[PDB]
Symmetry: D2
Subunit: 121 residues, 4 copies
């Protein structure tokens, strides 16, 4: 299992010790407060009112927690995933990333505390 | 395992099929948007800016997801609990509740979708 | 989870720390060598050649590992149970017992090492 | 998870759908009756009285259930493994094999029914 912090201004994202393999079932739980710029902070679901201006993940709100698995595209994580299986041909190290527009992570603040574990299969 | 919705205006809370027994390890993941009154909506961590005016759970923000286990006091759930063990002498059916002041649930809106499962022990 | 030894000459059986509750999924793995009398020893499946002369469990061979859950009748365990769910209205402490005829445990020898854990549910 | 039969006369062994990956925790439960030649049959622990005459696994009795993981040497399985982690650098498909001397599987009989699952990690 892995636990650690995902910083909102970390554009490269946070690499974890979790390698997703074919057939794996995982659970993620994310908590905390972060901002993509404004003084206000939002949870792992991000800001439902902010327009998408080039987010690294178009299937999640700005300020949401997302992930990449290996060299997959971004996958929404939000508050977490419950006993979750990946799409086919998706595998590799899990990296957690704050959802923001590339080149605009500089003014971000806060972080998400995240737990990841593999479940029974 | 249990999955279902928890309505923000449900003052009595949502009873689940999960009976927490001594020694049990559980995982909860909660998602969605709700409000304790304002047009704005918040995630299961609630509104970090709103003052506590008599919340059923003083250890969580207004609009947060909380729970009771049997006849326990309220316990913060927020975005969820990862492989979580209860305090001693805590057991019984799990009821999920929106965190608001008693008597003020009438103007709430939205809901949280919640997964609960028992883990390896 | 529980791990411990189950002595073949223990007529009362070995009480474990495991309380089976409704809905629980459990895994048991048993290993080792024991005898109901003869110099030969058998594994947790017991002696397939020996006639049943009043075994505490008629659904298992003499010398097999069995269990009671609460005040249930004996249930065959043998080499173990994989992600196993009990019949309805069966619950309580798990006690492991060597399968022999009541009053004839005195000449038994050896033991089984057993692991019991609760599984994801 | 995987369930299936392992034939005693199958010298090449039974390939499973389980790929053991680094970090994986697995549970195996094996049951049934088989023989390496004699009319008598033995459980997954094999025959404790029979001398080793060139067994594919020298750390288990003749007639015992063993396995290979990828290109590993044979690993004793016996009645099963409980929440088990492999040695370092061991990974790949799990193949279950009856422990006998190479070239002598022809007169074997019976089979073991085996369950394999990945556990919480
Ligand atoms: O959409 C992503 C961008 O949102 C801006 O925040 C805004 C706040 C109000 C109006 C427009 C952008 C941030 O300042 C910028 O860094 C980037 O994150
Ligand atoms: O604190 C809990 C209460 O918050 C009020 O909303 C307010 C918003 C701003 C200032 C005071 C109350 C809600 O209108 C009321 O129903 C109750 O939930
Ligand atoms: O059936 C259970 C009994 O089996 C006897 O062993 C026998 C071995 C061969 C034939 C008859 C009894 C044991 O001596 C006795 O203690 C009891 O366990
Ligand atoms: O040790 C492995 C071998 O055991 C023999 O069975 C014997 C039984 C008693 C004495 C010698 C061999 C089998 O006949 C042969 O096929 C092979 O499995
Ligand atoms: Ca920004
Ligand atoms: Ca309200
Ligand atoms: Ca006896
Ligand atoms: Ca043979």
């Amino acid at each position: 299992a892995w636990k650690g912090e995902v910083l909102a201004n970390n554009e490269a994202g946070q690499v974890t010790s979790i390698i997703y393999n074919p057939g794996d079932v995982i659970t993620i739980v994310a908590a905390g407060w972060a901002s993509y710029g404004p003084t206000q902070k939002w949870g792992p679901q991000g800001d439902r009112e902010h327009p998408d201006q080039g987010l690294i993940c178009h299937d999640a709100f700005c300020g949401a927690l997302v992930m990449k698995i290996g060299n997959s595209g971004t996958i929404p994580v939000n508050t977490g995933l419950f006993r979750w299986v990946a799409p086919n041909n998706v595998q590799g190290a899990i990296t957690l990333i704050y959802n923001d527009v590339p080149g605009t992570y500089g003014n971000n603040s806060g972080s998400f505390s995240v737990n990841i574990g593999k479940d029974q299969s």
